[PDB]
Amino acid sequence: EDPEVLAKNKGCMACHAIDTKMVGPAYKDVAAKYAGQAGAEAYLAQRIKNGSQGVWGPIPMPPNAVSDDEAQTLAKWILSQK
């Protein structure tokens, strides 16, 4: 289904926020810091399927069971949030 739909079925909208700061960096904000990358949604998918720290803060994102294609839409979904 749509990318956002995935954010709810996996729980991505639980620690993140299209703009408000919660457990992780806002979604749109994430694109503001990585903006300029030649494909940050692809690597974002590799870091979204395994999660990790040294990314935004000392709180490594818990790895999710999102297939590679689902984590790819999850990456472009964050940079496309509102």
The footprint of ligand HEM on residues 21-80 (CB under 6 A) is: 23-25, 44, 47-48, 52-53, 55-57, 59-62, 64, 66, 74-75, 78
Distance CA 64, CA 35 (A): 24
CA distances to 19, 38, 62, 79 from 35, in Å: 15, 9, 23, 8
Contacts of 49 (CB under 8 A, 6+ apart): 63, 64, 66, 67, 68, 71
Helices and strands (H and E) in the chain: how many: 5, 0
Q: Does 11 bind ligand HEM (CB under 6 A)?
A: yes
**15 labelled binding-site residue:** yes
Minimum distance of ligand HEM from residue 42's CB (angstroms): 11
Minimum distance of ligand HEM from residue 59's CB (angstroms): 4
The footprint of ligand HEM (CB under 6 A) covers 7, 10-12, 14-16, 23-25, 44, 47-48, 52-53, 55-57, 59-62, 64, 66, 74-75, 78
